[PDB]
């Protein structure tokens, strides 16, 4: 097995000389060996990407699924663990910067069938991981406008050159 | 009919995120005025609904202890009176039900 | 059963505490005392005779600013060997994933030994050897994230600091030596430096059925 | 005389100034106690620092719900701004639009949708021409439109605007609700509030009633980005807390000489109190209409 | 094609839905409050209504007499039916009920619904409340109201 994400938690950096940017604080947080499947718990994380705190735990809270409902215990230990070990000032200063779900060790059972077959069911678990940055959500990428459009059709033609000549 | 070729992940990517299988943002969760807790806005609080079912669940304790056995419903109104509480004369022919707390404030 | 037991090399508590005089900071019985402190004083020298409470403040001076550099350099073996194991983790466990840059600018007075105490030979055949000295100096302090924002402290600009620190020696061992056991701070101890960052503090968690009473 | 652009940023460094001396006449760290009493979320206490922490910072302590709904403090009862510093340990309750009585919110409202439509004015009319700005009047909300006064050119005592003239002012201030600026706060001595306004005449009797209502000459200062601003109470955080504006009408009142001053009348509606188009037309309507105080 | 079919397949059949729906109405008759799959609720909503108006009827009426007895399962209710909630529910004509959406079941995940009898002795539930009167919204259109009363 593997369990990097932990020490990815630990990782420590050097004093900040006084005139840099500061560096917002991220957190490593994950369960493991969660009895549910990671594609539907890729569909839970996938809704949680990118999403503010607050806004997260909202959606988990008024999801139906049971990833749902780990997944925001998940994310209520993570919030708690940066305002109580990693010095973040405000506990709804927090957004999901990364948050994926990866296979766990699963199970091998006998599925019965008709005659004498028989199939292999797969007793699936997953992990669930979670990075939390401090500091408010990214905005958006805004939609291509056609100007921008336009300005990259000229570019091209701008950029076209004369092939297979001096 | 056994498939006859197998699906790439490019083609099962596309299929498993296209939006129409991706979960929908909701915009009907507000905060709940009393307590705080999120709710729906259509949907009745939870922390609020169960406050009121659990304190629906032990007035429910005491008349099933008033009625003492099957098939005794009575034939009267029921008011529930908590403690320091006298019962109104409009409060007069109506079966009374004790609860040994003060009366909550949501409770009028 | 088995008759190999823990050998521990120091003690859980102070032996008969210093209690800081009142206004000892303030301002710029005494025979029983002192008794106790030379009758504790000729225990530690029959178990050891070459010992100079003289020649201690020094020694504690040195203890305390290298331990503090062991503190600055995460050096864990040499904080091992001037420091006890009561005084290790509420020392290193609440700096294991901080950066701590501490420095010793000067001492305003001398270094005063207050009290010497001393155990009963019945601690499992060792006897124990504590003395509390008074250190009022000048440092400076400043703790840094995970991430290397600042927390705590200031860096170039020093603070005044009193402490009144216990040392132990196990005087039964061959190979023992005079290191850190704690420090009494008085209950009379100004208030610290105020932290550089926001704590909101929750009130109670409630349960649905229960009711918020003031 | 001085230029526009120089009287705007001659105000700007002055209030920079200002805010930079209180600022450092509380330069060391200092941790007070401030208590949330409101009903969700009972008795929790924030440890603040002194002169630097807001009702805001209380609200991201909470929850980012807080934060989006809260518009007006109460601190010991009187109405605090989002964005105020905290001067001492106090309790806090935190005031939405749609609270049991917001009228606190709604005063706060109507001053800073005035204050906006004042600005909105002052950087609309021409070089040529001489803007003064005299008073935002407490009006009442029933009454249907938010009021502000001003004095007009000579060469503009006959000029009526166009409904052209008044979707420009209209497009100004959603520009500026676009621009989402804080509504920034300062309580300054009169002194400086009047080297602040010296070039106005009637700002200076609008600050000298404010030092001769309070004891000790201290008046609210508000500015969103470049325009500076006396006012008669606290204001909501941001311009972002608009969503329907509008500069419904231009009227002059009763008494010609010896100035002309005019009413500039507009109506508004938050982001959290939004209205539908046939209901917002007939505020529209109801707005165009004259309000007398 | 079910245009104009108003009632629900539920159970195992007609006299199945029949069933469920009186065990339901039995239970709200006896404890005046209860909660259930959200579209049960609403098919015994009807029906709850339609008994409180049997029971106003009567139970000197061998008609209502009748029905009470089929639908209250529980024969000491149908005194209450006739001498308690009708004579509570005398002045009104026909809102006696009261049906309000409860989150999901946390097993399956059914919509839920809680239905009670109007009156009561139990706590109330926490009912959704319209916006108050003091409110910018409210105080424009207040001020509106007051002017168009002014000028007709
Ligand atoms: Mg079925
Ligand atoms: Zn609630």
Redesign the pocket.
Same mark, same amino acid.
């Given at each position: 097995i593997s369990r990097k994400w932990e020490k990815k938690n630990k990782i420590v950096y050097p004093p900040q000389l006084p005139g840099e940017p500061r560096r917002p604080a991220e957190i490593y947080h994950c369960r493991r060996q969660i009895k549910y499947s990671k594609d539907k718990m890729w569909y839970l994380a996938k809704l949680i990407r990118g999403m503010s705190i607050d806004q997260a735990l909202a959606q988990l809270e008024f999801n139906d699924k049971k990833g749902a409902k780990i997944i925001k215990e998940v994310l209520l230990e993570a919030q708690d663990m940066a305002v109580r070990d990693h010095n973040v000032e405000f506990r709804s200063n927090l957004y999901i910067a990364e948050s994926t779900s990866g296979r766990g060790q699963c199970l091998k059972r006998i599925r019965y069938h008709g005659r004498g077959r028989f199939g292999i069911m797969e007793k699936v678990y997953c992990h669930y991981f979670v990075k939390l940055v401090e500091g408010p959500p990214p905005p958006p990428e805004p939609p291509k406008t056609a100007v921008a459009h336009a300005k990259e059709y000229i570019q091209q033609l701008r950029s076209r050159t004369i092939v297979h000549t001096l | 009919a056994a498939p006859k070729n197998r699906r790439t992940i490019e083609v099962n990517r596309c299929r498993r995120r296209n939006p129409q299988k991706l979960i929908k943002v909701k915009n009907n969760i507000d905060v !709940?005025?009393? !307590?705080?807790?999120l709710?729906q806005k259509h949907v009745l !609080?939870? %922390? !609020? %609904?169960e406050?009121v079912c659990k304190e629906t669940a032990e007035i429910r304790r005491q008349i099933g202890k008033q009625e003492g056995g099957p098939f005794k419903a009575p034939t009267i109104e029921t008011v529930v009176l908590y403690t320091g509480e006298t019962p109104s004369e409009q409060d007069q022919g109506k079966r009374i039900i004790e609860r040994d707390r003060k009366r909550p404030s949501w409770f009028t | 059963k088995s008759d190999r037991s823990i050998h521990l090399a120091c003690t859980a508590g102070i032996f008969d505490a210093y209690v800081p005089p009142e206004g000892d900071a303030r301002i710029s019985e005494r025979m029983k005392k002192t008794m106790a402190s030379q009758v504790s004083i000729r225990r530690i020298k029959d178990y050891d005779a070459n010992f100079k409470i003289k020649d201690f403040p020094e020694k504690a001076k040195d203890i305390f600013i290298e331990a503090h550099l062991c503190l600055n350099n995460s050096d864990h073996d040499r904080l091992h060997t001037l420091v006890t194991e009561h005084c290790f983790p509420d020392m290193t466990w609440d700096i294991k994933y901080k950066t701590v840059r501490w420095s010793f600018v000067e001492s305003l007075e001398p270094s005063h030994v207050v009290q010497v105490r001393c155990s009963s030979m019945m601690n499992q055949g060792n006897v124990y050897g504590q003395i509390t000295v008074r250190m009022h100096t000048r440092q400076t302090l400043a703790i840094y994230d995970r991430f290397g924002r600042l927390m705590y402290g200031q860096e170039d600009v020093p603070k005044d600091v009193l402490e009144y620190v216990v040392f132990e020696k196990q005087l039964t061992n061959p190979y023992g030596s005079w290191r850190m056991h704690t420090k009494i701070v008085p209950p009379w101890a100004p208030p610290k430096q105020p932290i550089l960052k926001t704590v909101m503090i929750p009130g109670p968690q409630l349960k649905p059925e229960e009711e918020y009473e003031e | 005389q001085l230029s526009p652009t120089e009287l705007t940023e001659m105000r700007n460094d002055l209030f920079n100034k200002e805010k930079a001396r209180q600022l450092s006449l509380t330069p060391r760290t200092e941790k007070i106690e401030v208590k949330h009493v409101g009903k969700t979320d009972p008795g929790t206490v924030f440890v603040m620092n002194k002169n630097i922490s807001t009702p805001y910072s209380c609200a991201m302590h909470l929850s980012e719900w807080y934060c989006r709904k809260s518009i007006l403090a109460l601190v010991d009862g009187q109405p605090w701004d989002m964005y105020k510093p905290l001067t001492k340990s106090c309790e806090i309750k935190f005031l939405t639009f749609k609270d049991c009585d917001p009228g606190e919110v709604n005063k706060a409202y109507w001053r800073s949708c005035a204050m906006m439509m004042g600005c909105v004015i002052e950087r609309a009319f021409k070089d040529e021409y001489m803007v003064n700005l005299v008073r935002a009047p407490e009006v009442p909300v029933i009454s249907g439109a938010f009021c502000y006064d001003v004095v007009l050119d000579s060469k503009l005592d006959e000029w009526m605007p166009t409904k052209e003239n008044l979707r420009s002012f209209t497009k100004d201030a959603h520009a500026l609700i676009y621009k989402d600026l804080p509504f920034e706060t300062l309580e300054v001595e009169a002194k400086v509030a009047l080297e602040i306004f010296q070039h106005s005449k009637y700002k200076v009797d609008f600050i000298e009633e404010k030092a001769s209502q309070n004891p000790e000459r201290i008046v609210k200062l508000h500015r969103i980005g470049d325009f500076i601003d006396v006012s008669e109470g606290p204001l909501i955080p941001r311009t972002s807390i608009c969503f329907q504006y509008e500069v419904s009408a231009v009227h002059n009142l009763q008494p010609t000489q010896p100035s002309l001053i005019r009413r500039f009348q507009g109506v508004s509606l938050p982001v959290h109190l939004r209205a539908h188009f046939t209901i917002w037309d007939k505020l529209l309507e109801r707005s165009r209409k004259m309000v007398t105080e | 094609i079910s245009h104009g079919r108003v009632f629900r397949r539920m159970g195992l059949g007609p006299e199945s839905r029949i069933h469920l729906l009186r065990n339901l109405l039995t239970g709200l008759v006896r404890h005046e409050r209860i909660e259930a799959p959200w579209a049960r609720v609403d098919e015994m909503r009807g029906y709850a209504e339609k008994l409180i108006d049997y029971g106003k009827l009567g139970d000197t009426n061998e008609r209502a007499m009748r029905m009470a007895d089929f639908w209250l399962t529980e024969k000491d209710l149908i005194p209450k039916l006739f001498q308690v909630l009708a004579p509570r529910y005398k002045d009104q004509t026909g809102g006696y009920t009261r049906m309000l959406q409860i989150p999901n079941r946390s097993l399956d995940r059914a919509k839920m619904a809680v239905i009670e009898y109007k009156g009561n002795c139990l706590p109330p539930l926490?009912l959704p409340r319209r916006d108050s009167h003091l409110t910018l919204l409210n105080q424009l259109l207040q001020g509106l109201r007051q002017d168009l009363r002014q000028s007709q």
């Open positions: - | !709940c005025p009393e !307590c705080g807790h709710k !609080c939870a %922390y !609020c %609904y406050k | - | - | 926490p």
